[PDB]
Design a protein around this ligand. Structure first.
Ligand SMILES: CCCCCCCCCCCCCCCCCC(=O)OC[C@H](COP(=O)(O)OCCN)OC(=O)CCCCCCCCCCCCCCCCC
Ligand SMILES: CCCCCCCCCCCCCCCCCC(=O)OC[C@H](COP(=O)(O)OCCN)OC(=O)CCCCCCCCCCCCCCCCC
Ligand SMILES: CCCCCCCCCCCCCCCCCC(=O)OC[C@H](COP(=O)(O)OCCN)OC(=O)CCCCCCCCCCCCCCCCC
Ligand SMILES: CCCCCCCCCCCCCCCCCC(=O)OC[C@H](COP(=O)(O)OCCN)OC(=O)CCCCCCCCCCCCCCCCC
Ligand SMILES: CCCCCCCCCCCCCCCCCC(=O)OC[C@H](COP(=O)(O)OCCN)OC(=O)CCCCCCCCCCCCCCCCC
Ligand code: FES
Lengths: 62, 229, 62, 146, 72, 230, 40, 64, 149, 53, 144, 168, 89, 248
């Protein structure tokens, strides 16, 4: 209980959230709150998301 | 003998009344090959460039199985212990890419790492995990809910219920990817329209009596699998 | 020949090798023709030889 | 298993329970089973003849293979997985469940006092070298021949 | 159900309605005996086609009760 | 307006799919009426360029793509990139980006995991002048610049191979690992072996350039035999 | 299981990249490979 | 627009190069996810606009 | 409601025009049209054959061909001779059914059940007290199926 | 094997049943000795048939 | 034919059959349901063929005569119509397929005894016999 | 329409218990819930059938313009009380509630105890208020008080918190 | 409803007994539908499961008239009462 | 017979008129639907046969092989002897170095025979079995050698006659594998001398694989009409009674 710190305010928490083992996949850690009341991913308004890579490659091939 | 421009490869092939069977929502990649008596389950995804030979013995595969690319599954015909030498794969089995399966039993919720060789007589029990680039020696038992790694594989550590549920969830995620890949294919093959008429096509040297058509009643049959012949 | 449009052969045609064995039999010729009459006479004579009393009781009584 | 880190895997041959069978044609078989499975599952995996297994192991919840058997269980749903066990392992099994006995006595073919239902038998380590006989079981419905 | 049982009911309703003074008691006795005879039996079967047949039988007894109410 | 354009695109795509299905069904029906069997030929359905709706593979024409390879979904190949025979690049989940002058061996499977933690890209990014041996399995990795990967090597998700690194054949880089620059790593659990020398670096660069030239020769030979598109 | 996107676009995750320093030299023949991502 | 992956990053330390590649990959993944979400949400609004009034017509005709 | 003129080739379509959904009339109910021969014999019905019944036979012949083909669409493992024989038998059966329909139409015209070119001196006076169909039929296709609205 | 369903062929001969099935001693005797019985061999099947009778 | 049918509410062929609206509606309803079930049966038979021509010919004979029961104006003609229908139903039960092609290769050199066919025939035959004799006795005593 | 809307609450509830519940024992709990609540629904169905057949109407004012005899009113009140007490639940018809609450998912257990039983109460109130009943309600009062006592005396012997809340 | 209209309380009681017993007889099998995994009950034609679209459409129509058939039962009642009205007139 | 004449006339009309008309309309509709769906779609192609690919003057000599998979890849100077088998997904690149496959040699599924050096002959002897998912690199594999599935024979390896590499083993570069010895492990090391029983097992495995390749060659090399006849035969067997089987 003393070392328990899942939110990383007292014990620093990796963005990777865990060190994967040399025999396990890099699965995320289960969150403390498993709520599924999540919206779709929120992007900022006026977000430029055009497929610039594909457009550039097509321009080169054109 | 082997000189032609159009490939003769068929994804599903029979061998002397050994007909493969495939369940609903199962995606066999057109680049993949399934031969002999192979019973694929419902919602099973065999990815590209994978070979499944149920020729010398049958191969039963569970429902939510995901077989990766470059995976060779084949049977041995006989085992030293007298057990059935047929591949029996559990219902939520994630076989990693470039894997080899040689007439072994794999129970449900089993994860096989990429580049793993599971030899003859091996029994991977329910919930087990084999890390990538590992070889299970022939006739070896992997206890249920255990994590192994090595060549030959050695016990690493027991698996928690969270890890087991994570593997189960990873098994279920491939379904919608297979749905997208299926949706990219129309039920009617359009490749026949791109060929040129041949003398054999226009002038059949031999004729056969009219029998039941292989597509009889297909106007009433749902086109659930677009890759069906 | 081969009438390709884009990639589709509009003249694509593979003649079916599955035909009834009696496709060109004499009995399948239009009724009233000499070939059909020959085949039908043979069939009727064979049936009468197999069924003398049946033919008598059916056609003669009819 | 109580495996330790770095321990090698154990042989399947060392974990095999042997069932010696007398088939209806009076022929001696030797099949392999694993603890935790049912005798019906072992017999069907080994393609053992004589077991009709019309209901195919009964219900999937509150099964007869659980320890202890749930009181709300429906028990076996036919009398087609009948195997006559030998005396030692039959005594070790104990007394019949009431539903299993009801299904055994409601069989069109004669039974014995050592008769058990295969899908009601859970394979255990003490069932090694266990002798059973499998005379031909009755066919219940029109689809037993389908 | 559509022919045999329908003609059964019409025998009690239409064709032999003048004999309903004797039909009612026989139908009531048969209905009571069937209800109190099959309630236990429908719960000792273990076959799909037996389930279908007993569904048919239960519906037949219900409709016999209905025609008893009709001939009143 | 962007959602309206997406709706219009999907509506037009669905109308085209309906028209194509109707046409194929009509052709099959005429095939039936003609007593024809051309419609029943079990020709292979494999497509080396399989777009997942809007995830269309994109590559420069300088690339060599094996006819039996399978580029699915969002794949982005740089100039002169060589793709081996039987190699699969599944961009159905996330993009698979490959740099200029990169060689991918035969029977190489590259894919992406569903999700990863924060700061870890779920896309398989491969730098320029990378050489990948045959029989490799890459998952959501980041290989940067002139990296040599031995054959039968498995790179797991979250792995980062830095510029100028060599991984010996029949090895496995585990998930979330880092291979420092200018080092040789070997073994299924990858262990450090030695720092790369100038001779080794030059030999690896020469070998990957030779592989690029061999890929160009393969494309030239396949075009002549009518086994290559365009 | 959770399936949301950790790599949000509305803002940048506040991180400290200096707390953990990945090893880059002096590896032994039996040591494990370092970890690529060490931001906290 | 500059393609960081298809660029001359050899004038930097390997850590800087891999960090730039990671940042570029994250940005392009965000853009791709935005496009995929836009296309997915299009699969909702079209059925909502097209078939909702037929469904309401059916319900109204059946009820009142 | 108007009916197709009898003794034409569309007189058999009057069989599909019914003023009431009843199968038959009552015992003492007068038929819609004057009776020509209530005690009709088989040869009386044959003599009363006309263009309406011939048109019914022609309609059976025209619609019987696609129906026979549809029946044959389920035939397998059959030679060409048996296929042609089965088609001929089915087509002859449909034409015989058309002959039966024409015979029925002639019998009805004899009995006055359908239009026979005759009208009663005084029409039966009926009050359409219960009427759920007049407004529906006057604004729909079904005005052609119900006689006298 | 063509025309024999799931029955397979090994090296020194061809099987008489599906893989992992039960070899019948009576079938082996019939196939090997087509009509030759040196003596009326009383097997378990014959003894059980006599007992049933 | 039923839709275009016309006539008087009366009894035809020596009052052995009744042509009235209710009997004709019962005839039509029986035929309509027979058509629905035959349509579904065809859709099923295009999936897997476990039935022969004789089975569906027996079904054909049932559907032809089973609506004629509702036209009966007498218990005599009704008894004979149900005798014909019971013979057709016995015919249908007779032509059920006995053996199938299955993946059960364990029974090729052993005798498995399935008795459902004989049980069906026995019970149908004896129920028909008892019903027929009781209906005949009832007819004889109703004539009295 | 009142009776039908009362009757439409069974299928979604059984579907929630049968498919959303994680416990393996919840299948039998769903069966018990269905059979008990449907026996109560059958009793209420008999009562409403009496009401509709005797006075051919569907309006409470039309019920106000009609009087039921003593026997008919007694039968109606007994039937409605017993049915809505099957759904209430009342002693001894709370076995289904105990089993379901122990085995149902927590969300449905919140919804089952919180709301549906109140729909049963509303149905009973609407049915009994519109009909003149001349019998003594002491039997029904005794049944309700016996239910209260029986539920209260069993709270000490419950080590399961959800079953204790069910008894409450 | 008709038994109450005909004033048959005993017949109503026996109908209720039969209905409740048969109802548990039917819903008892709903417990058996729980399976540890998805089943394989479809015939295989051309190496894939044969799903008959015509039978599926028939089941769709029957399901519509089974779920929402109470909304349209009045027309069936009218048709059946009209048919039955000919029995004595 | 007027009915039969009408039947024949409509058969001729339907075929010779409706067939071509419906086919033309369907092809036009399919083409325009494909055009509408572009570019967010793909169409079925004609998959090239890559099992006889030549490079400049390097032309395969594989006509003696008893089985070559339709989806296998054989490029360049690859010379195989009589009875050779190359299975599904295998890749033999003779441009990077000559490949010499011996008599009765089995190269199983997804085996990559690729030369590490620019021009080095990869010489596999007679009666040699190579397991699936193997990787052979510029090696000399002598006669009657066994290579297990998932095995990697490196650049300089020399496998003597009757040498066994266990499945999953990776032979190090320049490693000489002696005769009648079994090696195993990711660093391949001498495991044990092979017993005669295991030798017989390996011989039977090789003969079984040779005959299985013969069967697969019989199956995979069927023409389109033969494949259609096989499909019809399978669908007929799906509905054949025991009486029909007895008749056959
Ligand atoms: C008693 C008299 C029955 C009818 C006799 C008819 C005779 C007739 O039409 O004969 C013409 C035909 C040819 O006779 P023929 O001159 O001998 O020819 C030899 C070479 N041309 O000869 C025939 O067609 C032969 C008919 C023989 C019938 C004998 C009676 C059998 C019972 C009645 C059968 C009815 C059907 C006959 C045809 C069956 C099919 C061929
Ligand atoms: C700028 C160009 C724009 C083009 C827009 C679309 C134009 C459509 C042109 C249609 C031309 C029709 C020509 C005559 C066809 C008559 C129908 C026919 O022959 O149907 C029979 C056939 C039966 O098929 P089946 O039972 O499945 O048997 C398969 C056998 N192997 O049935 C079939 O094979 C099925 C195909 C029938 C095709 C006609 C159906 C028309 C229905 C009305 C239009 C609805 C919209 C369809 C397209 C979607 C548009 C969003
Ligand atoms: C419900 C929630 C609607 C709003 C969701 C939303 O805001 O989605 C983001 C995007 C607009 O972007 P932005 O303005 O940045 O919003 C983010 C912060 N407000 O939103 C959009 O671009 C629109 C996304 C809509 C997703 C749900 C659509 C469901 C279908 C409804 C169609 C209307 C049906 C009406 C009836 C038709 C028949 C008569
Ligand atoms: C403005 C408009 C412009 C134009 C728009 C476009 C064109 C519109 C075209 C409209 C329709 C045209 C129809 C053409 C004729 C159709 C004939 C027909 O379907 O008849 C049905 C039949 C007629 O009934 P009826 O005449 O009363 O019966 C004989 C009485 N002598 O009825 C019967 O057979 C009734 C049978 C009653 C008994 C069975 C049914 C009730 C019991 C079962 C209920 C349902 C259960 C499922 C049954 C099986 C369903 C498959
Ligand atoms: C099961 C389905 C319900 C069956 C209910 C059967 C009720 C039969 C009643 C027969 C009868 O005539 O009862 C009369 C009796 C006394 O009525 P009384 O007050 O004398 O009437 C004079 C003015 N009407 O009435 C009574 O004593 C009331 C009887 C109530 C019975 C219980 C009601 C259902 C409980 C479940
Ligand atoms: S198989 Fe049914 S009781 Fe065991």
């Amino acid at each position: 209980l003393l070392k328990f710190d899942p939110f990383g305010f007292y014990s620093p928490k990796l963005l990777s959230e865990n060190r994967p083992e040399e025999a396990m996949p890099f699965y995320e850690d289960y969150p403390q709150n498993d709520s599924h009341w999540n919206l779709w991913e929120q992007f900022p308004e006026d977000f430029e998301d055009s497929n610039a890579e594909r457009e550039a490659i097509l321009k080169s091939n054109k | 003998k082997y000189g032609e421009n159009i490939s003769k490869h068929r994804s599903l092939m029979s061998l002397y009344d050994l007909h493969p069977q495939i369940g609903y929502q199962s995606y066999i990649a057109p680049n993949s090959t399934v031969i002999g008596e192979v019973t694929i389950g419902n919602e099973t995804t065999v990815w590209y460039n994978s070979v499944i030979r149920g020729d010398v013995n049958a191969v039963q595969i569970g429902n939510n199985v995901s077989i990766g690319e470059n995976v060779v599954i084949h049977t041995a015909g006989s085992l030293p212990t007298g057990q059935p030498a047929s591949v029996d794969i559990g219902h939520y089995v994630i076989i990693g890419s470039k894997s080899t399966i040689y007439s072994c039993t794999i129970q449900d919720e089993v994860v096989i790492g990429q580049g793993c060789v599971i030899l003859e007589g091996a029994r991977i029990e329910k919930g087990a995990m084999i890390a990538a680039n590992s070889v299970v020696p022939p006739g070896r038992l992997i206890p249920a809910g255990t994590l192994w790694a090595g060549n030959p594989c050695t016990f690493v550590r027991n698996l928690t219920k969270s890890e087991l549920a994570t593997n189960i969830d990873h098994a279920k995620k491939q379904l919608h990817l297979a749905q997208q890949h299926r949706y990219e294919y129309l039920p009617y093959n359009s490749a026949y329209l791109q060929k040129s008429n041949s003398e054999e096509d226009l002038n059949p040297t031999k004729y056969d009596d009219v029998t039941i058509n292989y597509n009889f009643g297909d106007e009433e049959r749902a086109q659930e699998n677009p890759l069906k012949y | 020949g081969d009438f390709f449009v884009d990639k589709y052969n509009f003249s694509r045609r593979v003649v079916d090798h599955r035909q009834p064995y009696d496709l060109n039999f004499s009995i399948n010729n239009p009724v009233g023709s000499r070939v059909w009459f020959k085949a039908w006479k043979q069939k009727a004579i064979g049936n009468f030889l197999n069924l003398v009393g049946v033919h008598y009781a059916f056609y003669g009584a009819g | 298993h109580h495996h330790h880190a770095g321990d090698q895997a154990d042989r399947v041959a060392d974990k095999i329970i042997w069932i010696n069978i007398q088939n209806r044609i009076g022929q001696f078989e030797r099949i392999s089973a694993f603890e935790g499975e049912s005798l019906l599952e072992a017999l069907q995996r080994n393609k053992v003849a004589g077991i009709v297994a019309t209901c195919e192991g009964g219900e999937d919840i509150n099964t007869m293979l659980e320890k202890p058997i749930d009181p709300v269980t429906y028990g076996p749903f036919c009398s087609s997985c009948q195997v006559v066990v030998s005396n030692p392992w039959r005594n070790k099994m104990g007394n019949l469940h009431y539903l299993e006995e009801r299904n055994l006595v409601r069989s069109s073919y004669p039974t014995t006092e050592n008769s058990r239902l295969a899908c009601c038998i859970l394979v255990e380590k003490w069932m090694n070298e266990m002798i059973i006989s499998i005379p031909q079981n009755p066919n219940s419905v029109y689809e037993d021949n389908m | 159900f559509l022919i045999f049982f329908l003609f059964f009911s019409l025998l009690f309703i239409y064709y032999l309605s003048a004999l309903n003074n004797f039909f009612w008691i026989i139908l009531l006795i048969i209905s009571i005996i069937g209800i109190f005879y099959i309630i236990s039996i429908i719960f000792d079967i273990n076959l799909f086609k037996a389930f279908l047949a007993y569904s048919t039988i239960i519906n037949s007894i219900s409709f016999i009760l209905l025609i008893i109410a009709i001939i009143f | 307006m962007k959602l309206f354009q997406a709706m219009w695109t999907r509506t037009i795509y669905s109308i085209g799919r309906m028209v194509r299905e109707t046409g194929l069904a009509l052709d099959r029906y005429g095939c039936k009426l003609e007593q024809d069997i051309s419609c029943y030929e079990p020709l292979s359905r494999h497509r080396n360029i399989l777009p997942i709706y809007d995830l269309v593979p994109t590559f420069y024409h300088s690339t060599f793509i094996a006819p039996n390879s399978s580029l699915i979904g969002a794949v982005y190949l740089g100039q002169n990139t060589v793709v081996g025979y039987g190699s699969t690049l599944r961009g159905d989940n996330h993009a698979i980006r490959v740099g200029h002058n990169t060689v991918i061996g035969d029977k190489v499977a590259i894919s992406n995991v569903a999700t990863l933690a924060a700061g870890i890209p779920v896309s398989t990014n491969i730098g320029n002048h990378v050489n990948i041996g045959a029989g490799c399995v890459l998952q959501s990795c980041v290989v940067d610049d002139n990296v040599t990967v031995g054959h039968n090597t498995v790179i797991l998700e979250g792995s980062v191979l830095e510029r100028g690194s060599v991984i010996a054949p029949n090895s496995l880089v585990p998930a979330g690992r880092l291979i420092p620059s200018g080092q040789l790593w070997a073994g299924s659990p990858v262990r450090y072996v030695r720092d790369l020398k100038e001779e080794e670096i030059k030999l690896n660069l020469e070998q990957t350039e030779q592989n690029l030239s061999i890929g160009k020769t393969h494309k030239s030979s396949l075009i002549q035999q009518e086994a290559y598109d365009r | 299981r959770q399936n949301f996107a950790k790599n949000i676009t509305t803002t940048d995750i506040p991180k400290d990249s200096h707390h953990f320093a990945a090893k880059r030299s002096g590896f032994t023949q039996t040591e494990q490979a370092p970890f690529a991502y060490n931001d906290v | 627009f500059e393609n960081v992956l298809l660029s001359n990053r050899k004038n930097l330390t390997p850590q800087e190069s891999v960090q730039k590649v990671i940042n570029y990959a994250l940005l392009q993944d965000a853009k791709q996810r935005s496009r995929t979400l836009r296309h997915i949400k299009a699969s909702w609004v079209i059925p909502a606009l097209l078939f909702t009034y037929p469904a309401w017509y059916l319900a109204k005709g059946a009820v009142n | 409601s108007q009916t197709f003129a009898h003794d034409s080739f569309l007189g058999g379509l009057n069989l599909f025009k019914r003023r009431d959904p009843r199968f038959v009339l009552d015992q003492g109910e007068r038929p819609p049209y004057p009776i020509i021969n209530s005690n009709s014999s088989f040869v009386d019905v044959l003599s009363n054959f006309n263009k309406a019944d011939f048109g019914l036979v022609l309609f059976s012949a025209a619609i019987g061909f696609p129906l026979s083909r549809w029946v044959l669409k389920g035939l397998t493992f059959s030679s060409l001779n048996y296929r042609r024989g089965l088609f001929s038998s089915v087509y002859g059966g449909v034409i015989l059914w058309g002959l039966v329909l024409g015979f029925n139409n002639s019998y009805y015209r004899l009995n006055g059940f359908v239009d026979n070119g005759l009208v009663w001196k005084r029409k039966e006076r009926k009050l359409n007290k219960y009427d759920f169909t007049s407004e529906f039929e006057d604004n729909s296709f079904f005005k052609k199926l119900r006689i006298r609205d | 094997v063509k025309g024999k369903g799931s029955i397979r062929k090994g090296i020194h001969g061809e099987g008489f049943g599906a893989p992992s099935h039960a070899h019948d001693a009576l079938i082996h005797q019939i196939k090997q000795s087509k009509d030759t019985m040196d003596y009326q061999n009383i097997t378990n099947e014959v003894a059980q048939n006599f007992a049933n009778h | 034919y039923l839709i275009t049918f016309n006539g008087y509410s009366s009894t035809f062929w020596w009052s052995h059959f009744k042509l009235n609206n209710y009997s004709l509606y019962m005839y039509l309803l029986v035929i309509i349901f027979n058509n629905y079930f035959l349509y579904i049966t065809e859709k099923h038979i295009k999936i897997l063929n476990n039935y022969s021509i004789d089975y569906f010919f027996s079904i054909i004979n049932i559907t032809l005569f089973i609506p004629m029961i509702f036209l009966s104006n007498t218990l005599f003609t009704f008894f004979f119509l149900i005798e014909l229908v019971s013979c057709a139903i016995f015919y249908k039960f007779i032509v059920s397929k006995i053996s199938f092609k299955n993946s059960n290769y364990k029974d090729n050199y052993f005798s498995i005894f399935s008795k459902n066919y004989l049980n069906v025939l026995f019970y149908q035959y004896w129920s028909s016999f008892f019903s027929s004799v009781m209906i005949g006795f009832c007819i004889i005593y109703l004539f009295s | 329409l009142f009776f039908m809307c009362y009757e439409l609450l069974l299928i979604p509830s059984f579907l929630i218990v049968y498919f959303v519940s994680p416990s393996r024992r919840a299948i039998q709990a769903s069966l018990y819930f269905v059979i008990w609540t449907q026996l109560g629904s059958l009793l209420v169905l008999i009562a409403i059938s009496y009401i509709i057949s005797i006075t051919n109407t569907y309006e409470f004012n039309d019920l106000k313009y009609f009087n039921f005899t003593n026997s008919e009113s007694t039968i109606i009140i007994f039937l409605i009380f017993l049915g809505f007490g099957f759904k209430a639940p009342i002693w001894p018809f709370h076995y289904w509630l105990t089993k379901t609450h122990v085995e149902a998912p927590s969300g449905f257990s919140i919804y089952l105890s919180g709301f549906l039983v109140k729909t049963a109460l509303y149905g009973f109130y609407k049915f009994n208020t519109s009909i003149f009943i001349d019998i003594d309600s002491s039997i029904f009062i005794a049944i309700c008080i016996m239910g209260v006592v029986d539920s209260s005396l069993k709270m000490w012997g419950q080590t399961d918190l959800k079953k204790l809340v069910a008894y409450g | 409803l008709y038994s109450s209209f005909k004033s048959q309380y005993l017949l109503i009681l026996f109908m209720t007994i039969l209905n409740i017993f048969g109802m548990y007889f039917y819903i008892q099998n709903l417990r058996f539908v729980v399976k540890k995994n998805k089943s394989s009950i479809l015939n295989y034609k051309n190496y894939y499961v044969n799903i008959n679209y015509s039978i599926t459409l028939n089941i769709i129509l029957l399901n519509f008239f089974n779920f929402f058939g109470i909304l349209f039962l009045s027309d069936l009642i009218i048709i059946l009462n009209y048919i039955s009205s000919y029995i004595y007139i | 017979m007027l009915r039969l004449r009408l039947f024949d006339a409509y058969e001729k009309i339907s075929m010779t008129f409706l067939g071509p008309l419906y086919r033309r309309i369907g092809k036009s509709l399919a083409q325009t639907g494909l055009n509408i769906q572009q570019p967010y779609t793909s169409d079925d192609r004609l998959v090239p046969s890559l099992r006889n690919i030549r490079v400049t003057n390097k032309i395969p000599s594989i006509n003696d092989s008893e089985f070559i998979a339709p989806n296998s890849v054989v490029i360049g100077d690859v010379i195989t002897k009589e009875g050779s088998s190359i299975w599904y997904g295998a890749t033999l690149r003779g441009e990077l170095g000559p490949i010499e496959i011996g008599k009765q040699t089995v190269i199983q599924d997804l085996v990559n025979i690729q030369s590490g050096k620019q021009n080095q002959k990869t010489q596999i002897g007679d009666n040699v079995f190579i397991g699936p998912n193997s990787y052979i690199q510029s090696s000399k594999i002598n006669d009657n050698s066994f290579v297990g599935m998932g095995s990697t024979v490196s650049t300089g390896c020399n496998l003597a006659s009757n040498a066994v590499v266990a499945a999953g083993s990776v032979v190090p570069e320049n490693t000489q594998v002696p005769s009648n010895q079994i090696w195993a492990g990711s660093p391949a090391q001498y495991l044990r001398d092979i017993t005669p029983e295991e030798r017989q097992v390996l011989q039977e495995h090789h003969q079984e694989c040779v005959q299985l390749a013969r069967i697969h060659a019989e199956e995979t090399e069927k023409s389109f009409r033969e494949v259609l006849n096989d499909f019809d035969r399978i669908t007929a067997e799906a509905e054949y009674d025991h009486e029909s089987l007895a008749l056959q």
